[PDB]
């Protein structure tokens, strides 16, 4: 299918991005192309953040540290595949995405499934659980059936 072929090409672009980055930094155009637009056969994990120094968002800073550990653990995993990717959207680069999602703070972790829209449990319950990488990994396994076993140096 034309669509199947274009999907395959899209996935190859994400795999090329993976050779240079563990986490894809997105603006609104990239978010829409790779996360909102069909076709997809992969899950996307997104950290919505605000890391600019002038904002001094302490929680975003700590959560990014744990997200980095998680995405590194994925990169080195025997589980690594083209069926799951990690992204981030910073408020100051993707303000339009935050507006579309009705978000006026950070951070938030979401899973965007390949088919359909996020379900209730596709927003990580940060305010209950905290954001240890191991807890993010447990949530990802619950939502995607991908098991990332976190490594720490």
């Amino acid at each position: 299918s034309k669509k199947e072929n274009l999907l395959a090409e899209k996935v190859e672009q994400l795999m090329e991005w993976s050779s240079r980055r563990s986490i894809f930094r997105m603006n609104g155009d990239k978010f829409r192309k790779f996360i909102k637009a069909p076709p997809r056969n992969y899950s996307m994990i997104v950290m919505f953040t605000a890391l600019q120094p002038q904002r001094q968002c302490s929680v975003s800073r700590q959560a990014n540290e744990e997200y980095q550990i998680l995405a590194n653990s994925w990169r080195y995993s025997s589980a690594f595949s083209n069926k799951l990717f990690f992204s981030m959207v910073d408020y100051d680069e993707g303000t339009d995405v935050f507006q579309q999602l009705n978000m006026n703070s950070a951070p938030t972790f979401m899973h965007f499934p390949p088919k359909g829209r996020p379900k209730r449990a596709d927003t990580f319950d940060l305010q209950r659980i905290g954001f240890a990488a191991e807890q993010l990994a447990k949530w990802i396994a619950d939502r995607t059936d991908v098991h990332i076993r976190v490594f720490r140096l």
Binding site: A50, R55, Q56, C57, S58, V59, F98, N104, S105
Partner: peptide
């Protein structure tokens, strides 16, 4: 409006 702790 956007807000974050510290």
């Amino acid at each position: 409006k956007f807000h974050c702790a510290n």
